[PDB]
């Protein structure tokens, strides 16, 4: 299993995404938009401390890439999403995240996959008032 | 008969649009409150259009007058749009940086406006995307 995507590299190679997240979280005037910052600013030191100690909801899945296809509108590239058959034979769908330095072409059906997740609360609650989470991919590993 | 550029409003008057997005683009929408760019970055006034696509279907809420602001910088894609909006200049090369692209699509589609067609709005990645993202008020993932 080799790391094809890591959120730590996303933090340093896409700092514009990080800045706007923190500014949207700290913006007291827009209370329905962005991340709450409940477990710290996205990608901050507190964030990884809370990721480490397990106070931020996390899940980990292992399985096999079953479909490499295209979702969304007006896309230029060949694929951006994968379906995953886990061992409980449940379906999981996730974007084909890669780093600048990692190669998107290694995503092939039948190759094995591991995805590690974090779930960060959004300011906007669910209609019934429950806490709603932004699904944050932390790491994607794949076999060859 | 063709469904115009905007059709649906909030109970408070905000303009309502639709777009089906990738997971990577949806992550940005939650965490940046922005619609990420890709080619024309089309938004639709009708759910029936975007629902036809695979991905995360999102209902986008925009500030009143958003469509009006885009139309000022608007261009028409083909002739079908050039006929319904005769007052708009034709689409050049490089519209994605300064213009909003209006395009008539999905004619004769029974699900969408009884086959009448819909005028979608391309935000590109420039001023039109900035106008929309600045006026963005709320989004809602439909499954």
């Amino acid at each position: 299993m080799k790391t094809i995507y890591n959120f730590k590299q996303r933090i340093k190679e896409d700092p514009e995404y990080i800045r706007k997240a923190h500014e949207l979280t700290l913006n007291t005037t827009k209370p329905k938009a962005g991340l709450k910052g409940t477990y710290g600013l996205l990608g901050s030191k507190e964030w990884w401390d809370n990721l480490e100690n397990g106070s931020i909801p996390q899940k980990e899945i292992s399985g096999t890439i079953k479909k490499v296809y295209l979702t969304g509108q007006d896309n230029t590239e060949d694929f951006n999403t994968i379906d995953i058959e886990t061992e409980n034979k449940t379906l999981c769908t996730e974007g084909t995240y890669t780093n600048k330095n990692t190669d998107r072409k290694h995503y092939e059906a039948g190759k094995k996959i591991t995805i590690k997740y974090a779930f960060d609360p959004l300011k906007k609650p669910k209609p019934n008032g429950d806490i709603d989470y932004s699904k944050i991919v932390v790491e994607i590993l794949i076999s060859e | 008969d063709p469904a115009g550029p905007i059709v649906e409003l909030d109970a408070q008057g905000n303009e309502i649009y639709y777009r089906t997005l990738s997971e990577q683009h949806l992550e940005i929408l939650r965490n940046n409150f922005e619609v990420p760019p890709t080619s024309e970055t089309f938004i639709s006034p009708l759910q029936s259009y975007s629902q036809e696509y695979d991905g995360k279907l999102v209902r986008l809420t925009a500030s009143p007058g958003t469509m009006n602001e885009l139309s000022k910088i608007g261009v028409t894609a083909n002739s079908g749009t050039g006929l319904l909006l005769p007052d708009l200049p034709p689409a050049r090369k490089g519209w994605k940086q300064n213009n909003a692209l209006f395009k008539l699509e999905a004619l004769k589609k029974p699900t969408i406006n009884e086959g009448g067609g819909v005028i979608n709005t391309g935000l590109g990645d420039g001023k039109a995307l900035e106008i929309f993202n600045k006026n963005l008020i709320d989004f809602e993932v439909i499954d």
Side-chain angles (χ1 to χ4, degrees):
Chain A
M1 292 320 260
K2 295 296 175 235
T3 305
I4 197 168
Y5 169 82
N6 193 316
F7 182 42
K8 267 179 171 305
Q9 207 55 24
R10 163 73 162 281
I11 285 165
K12 297 323 170 156
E13 292 179 334
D14 197 2
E16 194 77 354
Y17 168 73
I18 295 300
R19 176 186 64 83
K20 293 166 78 58
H22 296 181
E23 265 153 16
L24 190 56
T25 287
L26 300 170
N27 189 10
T28 202
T29 66
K30 295 335 226 313
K32 296 201 310 170
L35 294 154
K36 212 180 276 262
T38 287
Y39 301 107
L41 296 172
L42 182 62
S44 67
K45 188 233 200 214
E46 187 191 355
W47 156 285
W48 295 99
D49 296 330
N50 282 307
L51 184 76
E52 167 62 38
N53 72 351
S55 50
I56 183 165
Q58 313 119 297
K59 92 178 176 189
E60 245 168 279
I61 55 161
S62 299
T64 322
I65 302 156
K66 281 270 224 153
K67 189 159 75 141
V68 196
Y69 63 120
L70 210 153
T71 60
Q73 298 183 221
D74 318 326
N75 294 137
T76 325
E77 295 110 276
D78 298 298
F79 45 99
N80 55 20
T81 299
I82 48 162
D83 288 336
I84 312 197
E85 190 209 25
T86 77
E87 284 159 34
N88 50 23
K89 305 299 177 6
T90 289
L91 174 278
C92 289
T93 305
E94 186 55 32
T96 63
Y97 290 80
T98 47
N99 300 113
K100 274 199 302 225
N101 163 332
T102 77
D103 322 78
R104 206 229 313 177
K105 313 207 186 177
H106 300 310
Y107 281 108
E108 295 191 17
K111 285 204 198 187
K112 211 189 47 152
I113 173 80
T114 286
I115 309 190
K116 306 217 273 187
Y117 281 111
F119 297 98
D120 205 7
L122 288 161
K123 290 196 202 182
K124 191 193 192 191
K126 289 191 168 171
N128 45 63
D130 291 348
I131 289 283
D132 200 27
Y133 287 110
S134 184
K135 176 194 66 168
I136 290 164
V137 175
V138 165
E139 188 172 15
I140 302 178
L141 264 61
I142 66 152
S143 78
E144 295 290 80
Chain B
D1 194 356
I6 182 181
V7 311
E8 180 196 345
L9 292 182
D10 253 346
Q12 288 73 8
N14 306 303
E15 315 192 338
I16 310 290
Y17 301 100
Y18 298 95
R19 189 180 155 72
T20 303
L21 272 65
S22 57
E23 303 261 330
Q24 302 94 330
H25 282 353
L26 189 278
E27 187 194 66
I28 300 153
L29 182 50
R30 296 166 154 161
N31 310 334
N32 287 39
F33 216 57
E34 275 183 348
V35 173
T38 179
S39 295
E40 323 101 334
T41 322
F42 273 127
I43 49 164
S44 189
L46 286 177
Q47 181 181 323
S48 45
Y49 176 84
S50 286
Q51 153 200 11
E52 288 298 331
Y53 290 77
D54 291 357
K56 289 292 198 115
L57 158 71
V58 191
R59 171 193 269 113
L60 299 154
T61 299
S63 193
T66 300
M67 178 42 69
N68 273 342
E69 298 177 35
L70 295 161
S71 55
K72 302 174 47 133
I73 64 172
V75 287
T76 71
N78 53 36
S79 46
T81 306
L83 277 177
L84 307 159
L85 302 170
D87 42 88
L88 277 172
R92 300 294 120 60
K93 226 50 191 185
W95 70 264
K96 293 164 172 181
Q97 316 303 339
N98 331 105
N99 289 124
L101 182 74
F102 295 92
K103 184 167 203 191
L104 171 85
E105 281 157 321
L107 283 173
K108 291 297 199 114
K109 275 285 178 296
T111 28
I112 318 172
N113 190 52
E114 283 286 333
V118 69
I119 295 167
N120 296 344
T121 324
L123 299 179
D125 62 22
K127 294 171 155 74
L129 192 47
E130 307 164 353
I131 279 183
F132 191 77
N133 284 329
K134 180 175 175 179
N135 289 10
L136 190 65
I137 286 173
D138 198 15
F139 69 79
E140 197 168 31
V141 172
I142 303 168
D143 263 19

